[PDB]
Amino acid sequence: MLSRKGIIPEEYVLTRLAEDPTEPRYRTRERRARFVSKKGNCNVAHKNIREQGRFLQDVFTTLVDLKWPHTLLIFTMSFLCSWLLFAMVWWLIAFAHGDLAPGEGTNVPCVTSIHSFSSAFLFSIEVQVTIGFGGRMVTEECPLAILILIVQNIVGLMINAIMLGCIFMKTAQAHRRAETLIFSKHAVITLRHGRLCFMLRVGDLRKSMIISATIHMQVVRKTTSPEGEVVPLHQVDIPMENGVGGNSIFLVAPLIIYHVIDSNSPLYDLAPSDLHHHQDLEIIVILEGVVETTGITTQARTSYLADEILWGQRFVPIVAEEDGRYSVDYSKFGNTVKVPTPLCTARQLDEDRSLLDAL
Amino acid sequence: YALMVSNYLNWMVRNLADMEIQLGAVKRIHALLKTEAESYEGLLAPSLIPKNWPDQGKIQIQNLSVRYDSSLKPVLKHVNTLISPGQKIGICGRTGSGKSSFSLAFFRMVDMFEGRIIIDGIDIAKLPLHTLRSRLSIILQDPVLFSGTIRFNLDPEKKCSDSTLWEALEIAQLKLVVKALPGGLDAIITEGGENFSQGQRQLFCLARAFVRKTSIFIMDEATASIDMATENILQKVVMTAFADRTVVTIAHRVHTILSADLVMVLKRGAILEFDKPETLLSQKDSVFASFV
Amino acid sequence: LHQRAKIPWRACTKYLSSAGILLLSLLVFSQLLKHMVLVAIDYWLAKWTDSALVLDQSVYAMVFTLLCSLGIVLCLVTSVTVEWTGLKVAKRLHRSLLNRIILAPMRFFETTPLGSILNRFSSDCNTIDQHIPSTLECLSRSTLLCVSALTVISYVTPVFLVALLPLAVVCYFIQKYFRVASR
Numbered sequence: 001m002l003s004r005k006g007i008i009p010e011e012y013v014l015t016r017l018a019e020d021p022t023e024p025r026y027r028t029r030e031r032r033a034r035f036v037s038k039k040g041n042c043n044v045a046h047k048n049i050r051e052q053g054r055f056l057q058d059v060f061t062t063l064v065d066l067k068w069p070h071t072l073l074i075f076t077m078s079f080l081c082s083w084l085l086f087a088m089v090w091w092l093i094a095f096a097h098g099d100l101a102p103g104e105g106t107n108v109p110c111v112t113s114i115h116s117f118s119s120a121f122l123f124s125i126e127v128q129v130t131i132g133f134g135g136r137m138v139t140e141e142c143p144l145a146i147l148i149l150i151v152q153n154i155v156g157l158m159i160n161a162i163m164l165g166c167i168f169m170k171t172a173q174a175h176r177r178a179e180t181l182i183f184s185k186h187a188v189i190t191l192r193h194g195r196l197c198f199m200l201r202v203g204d205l206r207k208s209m210i211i212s213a214t215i216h217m218q219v220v221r222k223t224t225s226p227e228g229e230v231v232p233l234h235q236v237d238i239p240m241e242n243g244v245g246g247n248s249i250f251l252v253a254p255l256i257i258y259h260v261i262d263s264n265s266p267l268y269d270l271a272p273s274d275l276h277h278h279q280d281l282e283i284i285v286i287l288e289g290v291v292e293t294t295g296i297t298t299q300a301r302t303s304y305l306a307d308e309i310l311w312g313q314r315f316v317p318i319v320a321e322e323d324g325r326y327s328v329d330y331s332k333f334g335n336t337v338k339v340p341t342p343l344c345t346a347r348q349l350d351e352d353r354s355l356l357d358a359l
Numbered sequence: 360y361a362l363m364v365s366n367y368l369n370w371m372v373r374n375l376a377d378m379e380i381q382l383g384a385v386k387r388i389h390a391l392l393k394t395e396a397e398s399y400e401g402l403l404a405p406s407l408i409p410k411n412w413p414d415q416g417k418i419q420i421q422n423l424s425v426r427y428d429s430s431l432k433p434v435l436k437h438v439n440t441l442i443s444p445g446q447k448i449g450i451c452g453r454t455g456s457g458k459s460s461f462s463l464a465f466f467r468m469v470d471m472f473e474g475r476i477i478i479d480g481i482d483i484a485k486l487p488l489h490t491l492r493s494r495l496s497i498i499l500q501d502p503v504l505f506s507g508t509i510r511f512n513l514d515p516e517k518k519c520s521d522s523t524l525w526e527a528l529e530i531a532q533l534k535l536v537v538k539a540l541p542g543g544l545d546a547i548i549t550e551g552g553e554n555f556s557q558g559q560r561q562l563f564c565l566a567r568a569f570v571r572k573t574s575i576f577i578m579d580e581a582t583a584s585i586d587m588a589t590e591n592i593l594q595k596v597v598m599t600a601f602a603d604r605t606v607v608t609i610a611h612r613v614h615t616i617l618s619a620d621l622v623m624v625l626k627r628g629a630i631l632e633f634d635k636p637e638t639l640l641s642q643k644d645s646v647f648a649s650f651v
Numbered sequence: 652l653h654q655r656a657k658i659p660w661r662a663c664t665k666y667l668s669s670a671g672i673l674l675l676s677l678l679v680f681s682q683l684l685k686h687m688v689l690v691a692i693d694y695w696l697a698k699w700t701d702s703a704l705v706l707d708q709s710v711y712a713m714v715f716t717l718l719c720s721l722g723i724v725l726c727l728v729t730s731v732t733v734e735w736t737g738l739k740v741a742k743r744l745h746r747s748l749l750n751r752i753i754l755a756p757m758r759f760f761e762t763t764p765l766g767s768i769l770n771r772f773s774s775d776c777n778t779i780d781q782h783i784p785s786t787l788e789c790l791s792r793s794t795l796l797c798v799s800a801l802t803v804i805s806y807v808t809p810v811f812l813v814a815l816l817p818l819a820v821v822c823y824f825i826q827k828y829f830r831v832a833s834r
Contacts, residue, residue: 001370002373002374002377002782002790003377014774015769015770015772015773015774016770016774017766017767017770018764018766019766019767020767360693360804361800364797364800364801367793367796367797367800368797370789370793370797371790371793371797372826372830374789374790374793375790375794375826375830376829376830376834377786377790378783378790379657379830379834380833380834381778381779381782381783381786382658382662382663382666382783384775384778384779385666385744385775385779385783386658386662387775388744388771388775388779390771391748391752391768391772392747392748394751394755395751396756397754397755398754399754428758463757468756
């Protein structure tokens with residue numbers, strides 16, 4: 001008790017004055033907040049969510065979502081709680097009926113060969129699992145046993161039905177197939193057909209096709225309107241520059257996913273110097289589609305921070321016809337090679353072409 | 360004892376935290392003690408290398424390379440100048456390069472990279488800083504008086520009596536204040552003279568300079584003074600010249616730094632012009648333009 | 652990296668060294684001997700009561716009286732030693748600080764703020780001259796009482812130490828987190 005009660009008096013004549021703050025550098029502490037991680041896992045922590053039981057009402061969506069070890073615990077506990085609950089009922093009706101006390105030859109017990117609680121629990125196992133080892137029957141002496149037998153059978157069948165359904169929805173999970181969809185770590189920019197385009201590569205490792213594979217693309221950016229609006233994450237959609245203007249894609253070998261930059265694209269004022277680490281860009285990419293083996297739709301997600309773009313590079317060819325079949329070499333999948341490019345905003349490229357045409 | 364364990368673990372942890380937060384206040388004190396410099400190492404014979412005391416005032420600066428951190432900006436570059444005995448060379452350099460740093464470093468308070476700061480032809484670069492810094496009077500632009508007795512404020516070490524100290528103080532200036540002074544030469548200066556005067560402060564500085572019996576007196580112009588107070592300071596300068604015969608004043612007041620003996624300009628860290636007579640500076644064109 | 656600023660011997664040794672050896676030895680010896688006497692008087696009370704349940708009893712009272720007197724005397728000696736050692740350490744630190752600050756370059760005063768020097772002079776010396784002695788005595792008494800209490804508990808029941816080590820681990824974790832936050 002150095003100052004348990006003696007700290008009440010205050011001198012109020014202290015000589016304390018200004019001192020050096022020695023505050024830590026803000027650059028090291030501040031790290032770019034990624035909207036989504038490299039492999040899905042959207043890093044958007046929610047806050048102040050009002051809970052009205054919505055998360056616990058849909059118990060079956062919750063059960064399928066949980067990890068297998070937790071599902072195994074719930075599987076085991078549901079069966080074991082029902083087994084123990086009906087074991088209590090069976091033991092107590094026997095002890096109420098007075099059939100484990102006497103051992104009298106003329107008394108007919110309502111549940112044959114009940115001698116303890118272990119026998120009652122084994123009888124509960126047999127009824128609900130439907131084994132019926134025969135040594136513990138149900139006689140006709142007390143109709144309450146028949147009613148409990150009906151209730152136990154119906155409860156066991158309901159529980160088995162529900163757990164079967166949850167297991168079937170957990171085997172038809174297609175979240176581990178979206179981890180075989182592969183996106184290049186870093187995307188490039190290069191003039192294809194005289195038009196500056198944001199390229200990318202996506203590949204599939206499994207031999208099973210993905211049907212109706214749809215690629216979306218968004219540019220997350222803090223956009224302010226002329227009318228004072230300050231949108232925190234104004235998700236702007238991006239055309240995929242397909243041959244029919246759609247988002248469809250047919251993926252067997254790795255493909256290039258390029259987006260031509262024009263006056264309508266938000267990336268129309270990108271400068272190679274403006275593409276540094278502390279920059280407000282994140283190019284979300286969404287690869288949807290239904291898996292052919294289960295018929296379950298999936299998403300594969302990735303993000304491309306500004307520092308994850310490499311200006312003026314192109315992807316190495318990956319497919320070669322070494323044999324009668326086509327050969328894809330995933331070793332070079334990431335590899336990129338530099339290529340000459342106008343190191344200036346894409347707007348200055350259209351202006352140059354326009355000025356040259358006029359001149 | 361099992362019962363009383365509950366209020367012994369608590370006290371152990373709490374007093375450990377208090378001791379840590381308080382031992383921080385010993386770490387900071389030892390941090391201040393980790394600043395070692397200013398060694399009084401006189402590598403000479405302190406009584407036999409110089410005479411009894413330097414008093415001639417023929418200290419000629421010879422190739423004084425001045426530095427403070429010796430990092431990026433030297434000021435002086437081989438000042439080969441001589442102040443003749445009695446020749447009160449009042450020279451004010453360029454206000455931006457060598458105005459105040461020159462006077463400040465004149466007391467060996469800066470890093471002399473090379474050369475030799477001569478004192479009447481003696482090597483003052485290896486002189487006892489305790490004794491050498493006492494027999495060279497100076498004044499500063501921002502006056503300040505330590506509170507205490509008038510004798511204590513003026514000359515505590517010398518402890519000159521009324522016949523010497525009071526006579527010199529009264530004659531120099533503030534005769535009316537001396538009569539007004541309730542005690543006289545031993546009256547306590549209240550809080551450093553918070554309501555005594557402003558120009559009399561510099562007057563007492565020159566009086567205290569005359570009390571050390573130091574021939575030299577390096578002066579500097581006041582930050583602010585009244586026109587009547589400027590005339591009073593001018594009379595004090597005239598009295599100092601007529602009494603000590605030596606001074607070196609670098610006055611920032613350009614319109615009042617003209618009446619002197621010699622002029623020296625230190626522009627862009629170099630001695631662009633030197634003129635032992637005053638009329639040689641006023642005769643040129645560039646030096647005249649910078650001096651007017 | 653700098654969060655663990657607790658100095659077990661980095662700064663504590665400096666305070667003790669400033670006091671001196673002739674005073675540190677006396678202070679440590681007095682505290683240890685006073686607590687040993689407190690353990691001894693508690694143990695003697697237990698034995699005397701045990702021998703009085705199955706019933707030389709006057710000799711028990713004589714020893715008990717002559718152990719309480721030694722305890723009181725040791726308490727006074729320990730109190731005086733702690734206060735005197737603190738005073739000497741504070742005096743020596745203040746003298747050394749003034750002497751060093753006198754012999755410093757003008758560049759130091761020009762560079763370092765006047766507020767820094769003035770603060771760490773006045774406020775820090777007051778803390779080390781009126782608050783550290785009392786806190787050191789309180790800390791010493793608390794930790795030595797705690798070690799004494801656990802030793803007595805283990806002596807009465809040897810089984811206790813078996814479960815002391817897991818419990819002590821929990822205690823250690825609590826201490827660590829509190830200090831890091833409390834600072």
